[PDB]
C-alpha cells in the first residue's frame, strides 16, 4: 500500500488511459458548445530549446496562482506516457497536468473560499483540473472548473511569459549570427510582441528567466544561459578596464593634487621597479635617532625638488 | 624567419611587485621536480609546484628582496633555497622533508644579481653577488656554519648578469657583462679583471649574457664553451670562447628592447638554444644557425624565464614563464618543436638513402619531381 | 568523449591578422591560398623553396573598386571551365552611404591572353553590380549545357532567394539570370540560406543539392541535369541556425550537417533511406558552437574523417568504425580519434597541398590570424618507407 499510494499521484508507473485519450478530445468538446469550464488558451514557441525553462516558470506559476495545485510532467518516451534533448529533428509530446490530491480524497467537503472554484459543491464531484499539452513547438493550455479571474489571468500569464522567452531567444539568435562575423546580417532591431519594441532591456532579458552597442560587440574581440553569460562577462570587461586606462591618462596629463592612495597603489602596480639605492644611518648602534633621521629625510627631499622633482600630497582617506 | 603560436599554458595569481632578477625555477625540496620561486618586495617569497594557482608555499625574509636562487652553497650535497635582501641579509631556508629561514648573516648591501657555482675548480660551490655600483664580491661557506669572503674586484662599465663559463683550457672563468656590449673576465687568483670589447652605436646601453651552453648529448658537465650577449637597443651575438680570440658564431639586429637571456632545449637533440624576451613580450628562439623562431604574447612583460618544470604527470618539460602587469604569471609547458626550420616531405625523404635505393628498384627516375609527386600521392592517400 | 590518441598534426607558420575575418573570408586561388579581412585587406599566401628548404610568403594584394569606407562581407574564387582558361574571382562589400548599407558585388578576371592567371593583372578588371539584398555566401557550380560545361556563381539573399550570374560570351561580362532555369530544386525558400552545397556525380549526369538556413530547415534534392527535372526531395527542419552541410560518401551517399545549438550528425544512405538514418558524432557539442568543418582523409588510410572547428576554439576529428571491422555492439559509427586546441575562436579551414610535396597541409583561419598545420614529418615519413618495401616485396613474390 505503500507504492498503491505513489501509484495514484503518478509518481511511478503509467497514465491512465484516460488522460491520454478521452479527456483532452472532450475538454476541448465542451467549449465547442460552451459551458462554465474549460478556458482554451493557447500559445507558440519559436524555437525548441525554450521548453524546460518554460515549464520550470509554469511551475512556480501554478503553485502561486493555487497552492493546492501539484504539477506532474508526463512525457511519451517511445503511445504510452511515462513519467519524468535527445536527437535533432525528434520532435517531443509531452503533456503537464495539475490536481489537488486531497480533494481527490473528499470531493464533497470544500474546495476553498470560492477563491480557486468556479462551481464547486454539491453529492457532487466538481473538482478541477489543468492540462496543458505540448506538441513540438505549440502549447495548448486547458483549465476547467477555476475561478474565471484566475484562469484568465493564467492564460495571460502564460501568453505573456512565451513572449519573454521568444525575445530571449531573438537576442540569443543575434549574437550567434555576430559570431560567425555577420554583423550586419541579422541586426538587433531589424525583425522586433510587447518585449519587442526598440527600448529592449537586454541585461534584463539576458540575466532573468521571467518578465518582470550591441550590433558589433563581439567584433575583434540552456543555450540562452551558455551565451548571454558570456556575452554579459565579455561586456564587462571593458567598463571594468577603461576605468583603469582613463585615470592613468587623468593623472599623466594632469601632473604634466591630493590623490588617495588607491590611485598610488595602482600606479606602482602598473609601472615597472626599474632602480634602487640604499645607504646606513650611522647614528642608531630612539626618539632623538628618529629626530635626526627625519632631518636627513627632509634634507635629502629638499635637494631632490632641486632637481625637479615636485612631492605628491598624500590625500586623507 | 617562421613564426608560431603556443597555446596551452597555466596563470598563476601573483600580487606584488619584483625585479627581473627575483625569479627562478629549480629543485627547492630535493625531488628531482622543478618548482617556481618568486620573491616579492614586500618580504615574502612564493613557491609555485605542478599547476595550481596558488602558492604552493610561502617562506617570509626580513626586507625587500632582490635576488633568489636554488643551490648546493653548503656543499653538503642538497639543494638549498637562498635570498638576498637589498639591504645587505642573506637567508637560507630548507623545504625537504611561515617557514621561518634556518640561517642569517649579514653582507655588503646593495646587491643586485647573483650566482652559485665552483669558479676555482676546487670541487666545492662558491657564491658571486654583483652590486648596484660596479663591485662584485666571492664568498665561499665554511663549517664552524659561516660565509667568508675571498677576492672582491671593481669596474667602472655596470654589471647586469654574471656567468661561468669553461674557458679555453678545461677551466671554468668568471665572466661579467660590461656596457657597450662588452664584457670583463674576473681572475680568481688564490691585473684582476680583463676587459674585453666586441659595431656599436651607444656606449651606455644595458648587456645581458649568459654562458655556458650545452653543445650535445650526454655533455653537460663535460664542457662549455659558447656564451651569448644581448644589448637593449635589439642586438644579440653568439660566440665561442677558445683560446687565442673569441670567435664570434652569428649577430642578430632586432628592433625591440631585449631585457632578458635564457638557454631552453626545445627540439630535443641535445643542444641548447638561446632565448630572448623583448619588453611588449616578443620572444625570439635562436639555434646555432641562426634560424630564428618568433612567438608574440600580446602583453607586457615585467620578467621573464625559462627551464624545465613540472606542471603535468611529474614530468620536467621546457617551459616559458612570463609576468604579466595584471597580477598573473603565465607558464607555457608546449614549446617543444619537431624541428626549427621548414621542409616539407621530399627534401626530408631525400636524406635517407634506403628511400634512394628502393625506389631505382621500382625502376622509376628519382630525377622526375612530377613522376615521384604522383607515386608519394598514391602511397599516401590510396594505399589499395 | 575521450580521444582515442594524439593529434599528428605539427604547426609550421602563424600569420597575423590586424582585424578579424568572418566564415566566408577563406577561399582557395590558383597552389595559392586567398584570405579577406573585414576591413578591406587581402592577403595571399604560398610557399617559396629554396635549395633545402622552404619559406613562407603571406602578400598583400590591392582590388580596384573598393572604396576605403567598404566593408568586404564574402569572397569566393574558381577557374574556369577545361574549354576555356582563366581564373575568376567575386567580392561582395558592403559601401556605407551614411546610414544605410549599399551592397555591391565585383567579378574580377582577366581576358587578355596570357595573363587569364597572374593575380595581380587580374587584380584591377572588375565589373560592378548593385544589389538590392544583403548578401549572404558567394559559391560556385558547374552545370552541364548542350556539350559542354559552364560554371556559374550563386548567391544567397536577404531576401529568402538565390541568385544566379552567368557570364555571357558575347559581351564578356557576367549577368544575373533566374535560378530556377537550371536550378528547380533552389527555388521557394522562406530563410536566408547560410550555407549551400551542390555535389555533382562523376561519369553521369546527376547531382545531389543541400542546403541549411537559419531557421534550421535543411533541404536535400537528387537532381538529373539533362531533364532539369527534380527526381526526388526531401527536408527536415532541426534547431538552430546551420552552420555547415556537406556531401559525402562513406566508402551510397551521406549528408554531413552542423549547427550551433546541437552535436553535429550524419544521415546516411540518402538515396536509399533518405533522411531516417540519423548518427550523431559524440560528445561534440561540449565545445560551445560549431562555425566550420571539413570532410577528407587526415589519417592517410585512404578513407575520410570529419573534421569540427568550434568556437570554444578546439579541432575534434572523427573517426567512422567500419561494420566490416565487424563489433555490432559498438556499432558502425563515429569515435572522437583525436582533438587539438587554440588560442583564438576558430573561423574557417582547407585542406590544400601547399608546400608541394604531395601532402597535404590544414590552413585554418581563426580570429587572430592563418595557421598552417603539417603532418608530422617523422610519422610521416616512417610510413611511406613500409609502405614502399611492402610494395616492392609484393612485386618480388608475385613476379619471381
Not at chain 1, 477563491?115 to 496543458?132: D, H, K, V, Y
Not at chain 1, 540552456?222 to 585615470?247: C, N, S, W
Not at chain 2, 621561518?100 to 670541487?123: E, W, Y
Not at chain 2, 635562436?286 to 607586457?300: A, G, K
Amino acid at each position: 500500500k505503500r507504492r498503491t499510494t505513489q501509484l495514484e499521484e503518478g509518481e511511478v508507473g503509467t497514465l491512465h488511459p484516460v488522460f491520454a485519450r478521452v479527456a483532452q478530445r472532450w475538454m476541448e468538446f465542451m467549449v465547442q458548445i460552451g459551458c462554465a469550464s474549460v478556458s482554451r488558451s493557447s500559445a507558440h514557441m519559436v524555437s525548441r530549446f525554450l521548453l524546460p525553462s518554460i515549464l520550470s516558470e509554469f511551475t512556480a506559476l501554478v503553485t502561486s496562482m493555487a497552492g493546492d495545485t501539484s504539477v506532474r510532467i508526463f512525457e511519451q518516451h517511445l503511445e504510452i506516457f511515462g513519467p519524468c534533448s535527445p536527437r535533432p529533428a525528434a520532435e517531443r509530446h509531452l503533456l503537464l497536468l495539475g490536481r489537488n490530491f486531497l480533494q481527490w480524497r473528499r470531493p464533497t467537503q470544500q474546495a476553498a473560499k470560492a477563491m480557486q472554484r468556479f462551481e464547486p459543491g454539491g453529492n457532487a464531484p466538481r473538482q478541477r483540473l489543468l492540462l496543458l499539452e505540448v506538441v513540438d513547438k505549440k502549447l495548448q493550455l486547458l483549465t476547467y472548473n477555476w475561478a474565471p479571474d484566475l484562469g484568465a489571468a493564467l492564460g495571460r500569464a502564460l501568453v505573456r511569459l512565451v513572449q519573454w522567452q521568444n525575445a530571449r531567444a531573438h537576442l540569443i539568435f543575434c549574437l550567434l549570427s555576430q559570431k560567425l562575423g555577420l554583423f550586419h546580417h541579422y541586426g538587433q532591431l531589424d525583425f522586433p510582441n510587447p518585449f519587442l519594441l526598440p527600448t529592449m532591456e537586454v541585461e534584463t532579458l539576458i540575466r532573468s528567466a521571467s518578465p518582470p552597442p550591441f550590433d558589433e560587440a563581439l567584433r575583434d574581440i540552456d543555450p540562452v544561459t551558455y551565451h548571454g553569460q558570456q556575452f554579459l562577462e565579455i561586456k564587462m570587461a571593458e567598463r571594468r578596464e577603461l576605468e583603469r586606462q582613463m585615470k592613468m591618462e587623468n593623472l599623466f596629463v594632469t601632473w604634466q593634487m591630493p590623490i588617495s592612495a588607491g590611485e598610488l597603489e595602482t600606479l606602482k602596480q602598473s609601472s615597472r621597479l626599474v632602480h634602487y639605492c640604499a645607504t646606513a644611518m650611522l647614528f642608531d648602534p630612539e626618539p632623538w635617532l628618529k629626530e635626526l633621521s627625519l632631518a636627513f629625510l627632509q634634507q635629502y627631499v629638499q635637494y631632490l625638488q632641486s632637481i625637479g622633482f615636485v612631492l605628491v600630497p598624500l590625500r586623507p582617506p | 624567419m617562421r613564426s608560431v603560436s603556443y597555446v596551452q599554458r597555466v596563470a598563476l595569481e601573483f600580487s606584488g611587485s619584483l625585479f627581473p632578477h627575483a625569479i627562478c625555477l629549480g629543485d627547492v625540496d630535493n625531488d628531482t621536480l622543478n618548482e617556481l620561486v618568486v620573491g616579492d618586495t614586500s618580504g615574502k617569497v612564493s613557491v609555485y609546484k605542478n599547476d595550481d594557482s596558488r602558492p604552493w608555499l610561502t617562506c617570509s625574509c626580513q626586507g625587500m628582496l632582490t635576488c633568489v636562487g636554488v643551490g648546493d652553497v653548503c656543499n653538503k650535497g642538497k639543494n638549498l633555497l637562498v635570498a638576498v635582501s637589498a639591504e645587505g641579509w642573506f637567508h637560507l631556508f630548507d623545504l625537504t622533508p611561515e617557514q621561518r629561514p634556518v640561517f642569517k648573516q649579514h653582507i655588503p648591501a646593495n646587491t643586485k644579481v647573483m650566482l652559485i657555482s665552483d669558479i676555482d675548480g676546487d670541487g666545492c660551490r662558491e657564491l658571486v653577488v654583483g652590486y648596484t655600483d660596479r663591485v662584485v664580491r666571492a664568498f665561499r661557506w665554511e663549517e664552524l656554519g659561516q660565509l667568508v669572503s675571498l677576492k672582491k674586484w671593481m669596474l667602472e662599465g655596470q654589471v647586469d648578469s654574471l656567468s661561468v663559463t669553461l674557458g679555453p683550457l678545461g677551466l671554468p672563468e668568471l665572466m661579467v657583462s660590461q656596457p657597450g656590449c662588452a664584457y670583463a673576465i674576473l681572475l680568481c687568483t688564490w691585473r684582476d679583471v680583463v676587459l674585453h670589447q666586441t659595431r656599436i652605436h651607444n656606449k651606455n646601453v644595458s648587456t645581458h649574457l649568459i654562458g655556458n651552453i650545452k653543445q650535445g648529448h650526454g655533455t653537460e658537465s663535460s664542457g662549455s664553451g659558447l656564451f651569448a650577449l644581448c644589448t637593449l637597443d635589439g642586438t644579440l651575438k653568439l660566440m665561442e670562447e677558445m683560446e687565442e680570440a673569441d670567435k664570434l658564431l652569428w649577430s642578430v639586429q632586432v628592433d625591440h628592447q631585449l631585457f632578458a637571456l635564457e638557454k631552453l632545449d626545445v627540439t630535443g637533440n641535445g643542444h641548447e638554444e638561446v632565448v630572448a624576451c623583448a619588453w611588449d613580450g616578443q620572444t625570439y628562439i635562436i639555434d646555432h644557425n641562426r634560424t630564428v623562431v618568433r612567438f608574440q604574447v600580446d602583453e607586457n612583460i615585467r620578467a621573464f624565464c625559462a627551464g624545465l618544470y613540472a606542471c603535468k604527470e611529474g614530468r620536467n618539460s621546457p617551459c616559458l614563464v612570463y609576468v604579466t602587469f595584471n597580477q598573473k604569471i603565465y607558464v607555457y609547458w608546449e614549446v617543444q618543436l619537431e624541428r626549427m626550420e621548414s621542409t616539407n616531405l621530399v627534401k626530408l625523404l631525400e636524406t635517407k638513402p634506403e628511400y634512394h635505393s628502393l625506389l631505382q628498384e621500382l625502376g622509376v627516375d628519382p630525377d622526375d619531381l612530377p613522376v615521384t609527386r604522383a607515386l608519394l600521392h598514391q602511397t599516401l592517400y590510396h594505399p589499395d | 568523449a575521450v580521444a582515442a590518441g594524439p593529434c599528428p598534426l605539427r604547426e609550421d607558420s602563424f600569420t597575423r591578422f590586424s582585424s578579424q575575418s568572418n566564415v566566408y573570408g577563406l577561399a582557395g586561388g590558383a597552389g595559392e591560398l586567398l584570405a579577406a579581412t573585414l576591413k578591406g585587406k587581402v592577403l595571399g599566401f604560398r610557399y617559396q623553396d629554396l635549395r633545402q628548404k622552404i619559406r613562407p610568403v603571406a602578400k598583400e594584394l590591392q582590388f580596384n573598386y573598393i572604396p576605403v569606407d567598404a566593408e568586404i562581407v564574402s569572397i569566393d574564387t574558381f577557374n574556369k571551365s577545361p574549354p576555356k582558361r582563366g581564373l575568376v574571382v567575386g567580392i561582395t562589400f558592403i559601401k556605407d552611404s551614411g546610414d544605410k548599407g549599399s551592397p555591391f558585388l565585383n567579378i574580377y578576371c582577366d581576358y587578355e591572353p596570357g595573363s587569364e592567371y597572374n593575380l595581380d593583372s587580374i587584380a584591377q578588371s572588375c565589373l560592378n553590380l548593385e544589389l538590392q539584398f544583403t548578401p549572404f555566401q558567394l559559391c560556385h557550380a558547374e552545370v552541364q549545357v548542350g556539350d559542354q560545361l559552364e560554371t556559374v556563381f550563386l548567391l544567397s539573399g536577404n531576401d529568402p532567394a538565390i541568385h544566379l550570374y552567368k557570364e555571357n560570351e558575347g559581351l564578356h561580362q557576367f549577368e544575373e539570370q533566374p535560378v530556377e532555369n537550371l536550378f528547380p530544386e533552389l527555388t521557394n525558400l522562406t530563410s536566408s540560406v547560410l550555407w549551400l552545397d551542390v555535389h555533382n556525380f562523376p561519369g553521369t549526369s546527376r547531382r545531389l543539392s543541400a542546403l541549411g538556413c537559419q531557421s534550421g530547415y535543411v533541404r536535400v534534392a537528387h537532381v538529373d541535369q539533362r531533364s532539369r527535372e527534380v527526381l526526388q526531395m526531401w527536408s527536415v527542419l532541426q534547431d538552430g541556425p546551420i552552420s555547415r552541410v556537406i556531401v559525402f560518401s562513406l566508402s551510397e551517399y551521406s549528408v554531413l550537417v552542423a549547427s550551433m545549438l546541437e552535436p553535429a550528425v550524419v544521415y546516411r544512405d540518402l538515396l536509399n533511406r533518405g533522411l531516417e538514418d540519423q548518427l550523431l558524432l559524440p560528445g561534440s557539442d561540449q565545445f560551445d558552437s560549431v562555425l566550420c568543418s571539413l570532410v577528407t582523409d587526415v589519417d592517410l588510410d585512404g578513407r575520410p574523417e570529419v573534421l569540427v572547428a568550434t568556437y570554444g576554439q578546439e579541432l575534434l576529428c572523427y573517426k567512422y568504425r567500419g561494420p566490416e571491422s565487424g563489433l555490432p555492439e559498438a556499432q558502425h559509427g563515429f569515435h572522437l580519434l583525436w582533438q587539438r586546441s587554440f588560442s583564438s575562436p576558430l573561423l574557417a579551414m582547407a585542406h590544400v597541398d601547399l608546400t608541394g610535396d604531395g601532402l597535404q597541409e590544414l590552413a585554418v583561419v581563426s580570429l587572430k590570424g592563418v595557421h598552417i598545420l603539417q603532418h608530422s614529418l617523422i610519422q610521416a615519413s616512417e610510413l611511406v618507407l613500409t609502405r614502399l618495401r611492402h610494395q616492392v616485396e609484393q612485386r618480388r613474390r608475385r613476379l619471381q
